[PDB]
Design a protein around this ligand. Sequence first.
Ligand SMILES: O=C(O)[C@H](O)[C@@H](O)COP(=O)(O)O
Ligand SMILES: O=C(O)[C@H](O)[C@@H](O)COP(=O)(O)O
Ligand SMILES: O=C(O)[C@H](O)[C@@H](O)COP(=O)(O)O
Ligand SMILES: O=C(O)[C@H](O)[C@@H](O)COP(=O)(O)O
Ligand SMILES: [Cl-]
Ligand SMILES: [Cl-]
Ligand SMILES: [Cl-]
Ligand SMILES: [Cl-]
Ligand SMILES: [Cl-]
Ligand SMILES: [Cl-]
Ligand SMILES: [Cl-]
Ligand SMILES: [Cl-]
Ligand SMILES: [Cl-]
Ligand code: NA
Ligand code: NA
Lengths: 229, 229, 229, 229
Amino acid sequence: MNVEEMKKIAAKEALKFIEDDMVIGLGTGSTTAYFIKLLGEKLKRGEISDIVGVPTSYQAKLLAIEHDIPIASLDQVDAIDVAVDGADEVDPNLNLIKGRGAALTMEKIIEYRAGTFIVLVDERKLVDYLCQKMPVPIEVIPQAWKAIIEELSIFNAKAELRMGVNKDGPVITDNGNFIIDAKFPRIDDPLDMEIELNTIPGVIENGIFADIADIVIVGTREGVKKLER
Amino acid sequence: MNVEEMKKIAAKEALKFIEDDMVIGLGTGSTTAYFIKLLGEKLKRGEISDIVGVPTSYQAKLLAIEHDIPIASLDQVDAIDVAVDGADEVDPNLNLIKGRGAALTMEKIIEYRAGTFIVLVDERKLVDYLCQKMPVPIEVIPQAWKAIIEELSIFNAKAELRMGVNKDGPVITDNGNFIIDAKFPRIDDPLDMEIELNTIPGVIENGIFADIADIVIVGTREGVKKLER
Amino acid sequence: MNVEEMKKIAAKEALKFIEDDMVIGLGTGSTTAYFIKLLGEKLKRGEISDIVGVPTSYQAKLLAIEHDIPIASLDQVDAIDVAVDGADEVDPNLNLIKGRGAALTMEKIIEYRAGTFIVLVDERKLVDYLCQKMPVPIEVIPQAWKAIIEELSIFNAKAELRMGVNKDGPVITDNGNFIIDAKFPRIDDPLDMEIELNTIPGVIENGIFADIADIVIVGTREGVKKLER
Amino acid sequence: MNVEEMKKIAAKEALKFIEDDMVIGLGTGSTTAYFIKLLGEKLKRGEISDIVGVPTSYQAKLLAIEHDIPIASLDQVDAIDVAVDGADEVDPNLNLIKGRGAALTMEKIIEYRAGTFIVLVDERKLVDYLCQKMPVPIEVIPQAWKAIIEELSIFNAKAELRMGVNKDGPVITDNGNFIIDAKFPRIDDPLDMEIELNTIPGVIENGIFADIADIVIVGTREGVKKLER
Ligand SMILES: O=C(O)[C@H](O)[C@@H](O)COP(=O)(O)O
Ligand SMILES: O=C(O)[C@H](O)[C@@H](O)COP(=O)(O)O
Ligand SMILES: O=C(O)[C@H](O)[C@@H](O)COP(=O)(O)O
Ligand SMILES: O=C(O)[C@H](O)[C@@H](O)COP(=O)(O)O
Ligand SMILES: [Cl-]
Ligand SMILES: [Cl-]
Ligand SMILES: [Cl-]
Ligand SMILES: [Cl-]
Ligand SMILES: [Cl-]
Ligand SMILES: [Cl-]
Ligand SMILES: [Cl-]
Ligand SMILES: [Cl-]
Ligand SMILES: [Cl-]
Ligand code: NA
Ligand code: NA
């Protein structure tokens, strides 16, 4: 029904979870962008009120501003009620890979504190197992990049430094860091792999989001589907 | 000869200016990358020796490491004998536009102190005047991006925030900043424009490199040309 | 009749220039902290409303949040109506030196765009010329620090890299940079110097705020006095 | 023996582990500074040759340069043979607290990869249990700071944002982050807590250095004492 349609419906269904007076974590990427626009429209209409967004990236912040959604940083609010974001993969147990957009650090910081974490994606993102289709982004302190890559050979990860297109050299994240894309053949224990990667000195955050998503809203070629756990 | 062939010939020619015991500023982008690779091969072969490169970007640093060239940061060296780098545009008085690769801040810090600054370009980079074909990249403190865009426009430039391809949101420079591409009409006084642009609070560096290039090595369709101050 | 009383009365006077529907740049340091607390208390009472603060530092932001003043970054607002901040020195022509607090980059970014920049100070700050009592803080790209300190030689400035007390190594600014404090003999033309310092590749911003203050409110032993240009 | 000499002795002893052709992690702080100076002296006199230092901080890098010790970042070298650094506390099982100098991130990045990690302290730094006298420094992504303090206080840690003295606002680390100092009554399980702290989103590194030290060289009233497990 066209990918973009599968994303928008996921995004429309997400609104059902947003109520007045909420603090909302605003995610990064094309699917969530739809949700942000739909949200600002509903605000303007008056059909929702007293919403504050906590953007997970400059992209989110800018879009929120354009659609006149009031925003605040995490340290300005007392709690994140609901957080809405995309994902690069969604496994059966609702473990995710995120980070294509390179905003994984702020995303986890905000989504970790959210009462409910809502994930929006289209059909393509569903996988049988993590790393079936995509690598795991890992944000690293620049000087540790090579060692980390070499250290990931124990897990047979083919890891590569992500490189800029609209700048020369490595992609730099919003926090001044490099981003390694690690294609594992498989990851059998996402939660513990998440922990493992974070215990490596130099690793800032990794794109495995396990034990964190509350609901996954999927946009199918035939309406909408939802995954819960 | 095609373009790449033209870049290569310019890089080869520059080697003639490199001698044993030199501290060499290593520039950013495709044309200079040929130079770094050839410099590395010369060193490996014993054709040159006792050289130290001072990289103008993570790109240059990483390329040097891969090609076994000893490096050092600017504060580690006594001086910079020669700096070799590319350009987006070169006008008849040897004033340049740089910054496509988004590394203008370190490029200028290093090239500003070089005994000789050598520029490597293919024929296309020659312009009748600065801004005939390319915009001036401006590195800005992130939160000043909008104000600066608005201010430049009042000054008759079309400016836009450079956006990431391998990340969502804006391109982030190696120092954690945003970068704006501003197309001015034609700049008749590059040096005063370069100086006064930097006076704007939030403007960290701009891509006008005036009164600093000493030699421009130009790869042409059939051979090599050398322009000089 | 001591310094803190002098600071408070200047802060109290400043509040007089604030009206409903204003975007206010919130300065850095103890004098301005008094202003931020009074602005918050008046907002608590209901005596002014619809104000948004744009913080010049984490310090100002944190205090604003603690005093429940709505805030935003520069890029979220349409303009800055009034900006309030302190200074290390104020000369007769109302040029300043700022940056003891190391927030000079953000301060100048916000203050440059203010409809009215109000400076608050106790009488210790008044000087007969700039650098009579204090040095000029200069924010610099870390790897350029040694070269810049050497190059400052021509000005006969005694310059030192500012060192951490609650960290080892150099003070790091909010943007990840170093500060060199430079005590010049006496600055003839603050404006020219302000410009000349910034023209040095690697110098990001300097503490000379010339031709930008509109009003200086001064707490003295005799009570409050106001200076305008 | 006065304080320093305890330090000087330990450093003197440490040099005995250093051999020709080694890559050496250069730690942060007053104790290790004596080591870097002695090493510089030994290299100047030809007693050791062909060494490369990998600094853990700007303080270490700048002290190394002053003493003509060649240096490199981690990604420039194939391995770290020995890393030498100080500590705020040492427990009986040779687990440490570090981070008073705010350089814990690069410290752990380098020392984790060292063939042998040697720790230098005087008598005072020994403790019966971790946190008997020092807080655990935790480096955090700035917007997560308040949430992290709240989350930590749910575990009996008294935790405070470390504040600048030579800047206003929070201390900023070399990587542009904040530091939170957390005092638990005690840490019976150092390694477990070290891991747990790092799994919190927004925590980048913590000052617990468990099961990584290979040798602790203690300057002792007596004279000296090399501890190992
Ligand atoms: O993690 C991210 O960067 C994004 O949310 C990514 O997972 C999905 O972005 P998309 O909606 O454009 O596919
Ligand atoms: O300034 C830069 O970023 C580069 O040197 C650019 O000007 C040239 O890149 P190129 O050699 O790949 O065309
Ligand atoms: O420039 C700064 O950092 C401050 O505004 C400073 O100059 C004034 O601080 P104070 O009001 O505590 O003296
Ligand atoms: O961890 C650090 O930052 C330092 O090693 C420090 O904690 C020990 O410093 P000292 O040798 O000056 O006491
Ligand atoms: Cl992302
Ligand atoms: Cl780069
Ligand atoms: Cl560039
Ligand atoms: Cl890109
Ligand atoms: Cl972004
Ligand atoms: Cl300041
Ligand atoms: Cl400090
Ligand atoms: Cl440091
Ligand atoms: Cl601050
Ligand atoms: Na950073
Ligand atoms: Na920066």
